[PDB]
């Protein structure tokens, strides 16, 4: 019987549906994006951090400047701990989300606490989380739409308006990125032999309280608890690279 | 001139999970956890044979165990660093929750930090946000709805099956009070005057209220019974 589970995902595809849907049972932990942090600014990755190889001026001028931050200094066994313990409901089921462009940054991490258990991502999640989470895995066919919603999220920073600029080039970079964390999830599901309990989106959009369901029984809980305008840019992406 | 961040402050079961969550859609409100609930000893939020530890057989058999988790070994600098960056969102702004019995807690832990700016709840409160927040302040005026679902759920530990029993939701009813006293009288003991919706208010116009907290954070309000078997007749247990 797991006491965990961990949402395997990329930015912006649909993880968040299903993990508030999650989190409203009062059951299921408090994910949060535990993972998401850069050691040198103890932040979540900025917007001009995302484009660091965009030499593009169009496109760098719609993001906002870098701030600066500074160096997560939590030791590896401080950090695995808080982390065990603001994602856990009083029932002691654990949960959190994780994008795989975070993977190296959580073996990275993991690598200096003791007991580490393995030199992977397998072992890295298993000895963090502190126990062996049922994995899940959230993904999208539509890269475009998704892209889009990307792309706008990061100039706008908000990831739930007037500023948000249409841009090929960017859209081209964010889809050619989604698209290898694909690639990057998918190889590793067959290099750890890992079967996730997966859930592409739009199966995810119409079954929300089957899925909320299914892993809340996965968890041990009862089933019972899972409760109940287009993109000109999409359209304007396509005849416009890769997809 | 925006504020960057909000404190909830309130009590277990007011309408306080169900405010923050809202703001928490919103993608601009940051993530507003109850941060300030775990003990140091075990590392976990209070527990149910934790809360009642004052002396009858009859409560002590309706609750689960005592688990023991771990010793909280961060130093102060970095559970408030921890804090701080977990509570925002990318915009910038920070929210969380604060609950009168957690204040102590809080102000324990916050003696550690550098730059102490004071000595009270409220340079904690500043010192740990690393700003000024907007305060919000939640009460269920029905003292007994409240009571209950806190019962209920102090044994059910789901806190959004075991039974009624009386003697309890007394303690209860009472602690929860002394809890609300708490509050009010730090309202006035620190001149301060927070925003003051109720549960009625919020479990019926809560699209107001949330619209209400994101313009203080200068946002866009746009973005958004075992009672009555309470309600003993002939013990005399407070109400
Ligand atoms: O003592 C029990 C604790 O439970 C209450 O809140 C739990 O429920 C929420 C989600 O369902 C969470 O925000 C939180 O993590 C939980 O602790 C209560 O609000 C607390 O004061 C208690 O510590
Ligand atoms: O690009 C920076 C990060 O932003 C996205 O996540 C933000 O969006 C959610 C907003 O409600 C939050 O849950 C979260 O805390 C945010 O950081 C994205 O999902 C990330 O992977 C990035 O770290």
Redesign the interface.
């Given at each position: 019987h797991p006491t965990a589970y961990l949402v395997l995902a990329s930015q912006r595809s649909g993880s968040t549906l299903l993990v508030?849907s999650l989190?409203?049972?009062?059951?299921a932990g408090?994910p949060?994006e535990?993972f998401q942090?850069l050691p040198n600014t103890?932040?979540?990755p900025?917007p001009r951090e995302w484009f660091a190889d965009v030499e593009d001026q169009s496109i760098l001028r719609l993001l906002d400047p870098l701030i600066e931050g500074?160096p997560?200094?939590?030791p590896a066994?401080?950090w695995r701990?808080?982390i065990q313990?603001?994602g856990?409901?009083?029932?002691?089921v654990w949960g959190g989300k994780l994008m795989w462009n975070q993977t190296p940054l959580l073996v990275q991490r993991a690598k200096d606490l003791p007991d580490r258990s393995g030199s992977g991502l397998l072992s890295a999640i298993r000895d963090v989380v502190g126990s062996d989470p049922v994995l899940i895995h959230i993904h999208r066919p539509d890269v475009v739409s998704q892209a889009v919603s990307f792309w706008r999220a990061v100039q706008t920073?908000?990831?739930?308006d007037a500023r948000a600029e249409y841009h090929a080039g960017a859209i081209a970079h964010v889809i050619t990125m989604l698209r290898a964390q694909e690639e990057g999830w998918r190889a590793w599901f067959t290099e750890e032999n890992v079967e996730p309990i997966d859930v592409d989106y739009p199966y995810l959009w119409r079954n929300l309280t089957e899925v909320v369901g299914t892993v809340l029984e996965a968890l041990g809980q009862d089933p019972r608890?899972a409760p109940k305008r287009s993109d000109e840019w999409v359209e304007r992406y396509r005849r416009d690279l890769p997809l």
């Open positions: 508030e989190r409203a049972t009062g059951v408090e949060q535990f942090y103890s932040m979540s900025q500074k997560d200094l939590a066994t401080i701990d808080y313990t603001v856990r409901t009083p029932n002691g920073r908000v990831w739930r608890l």
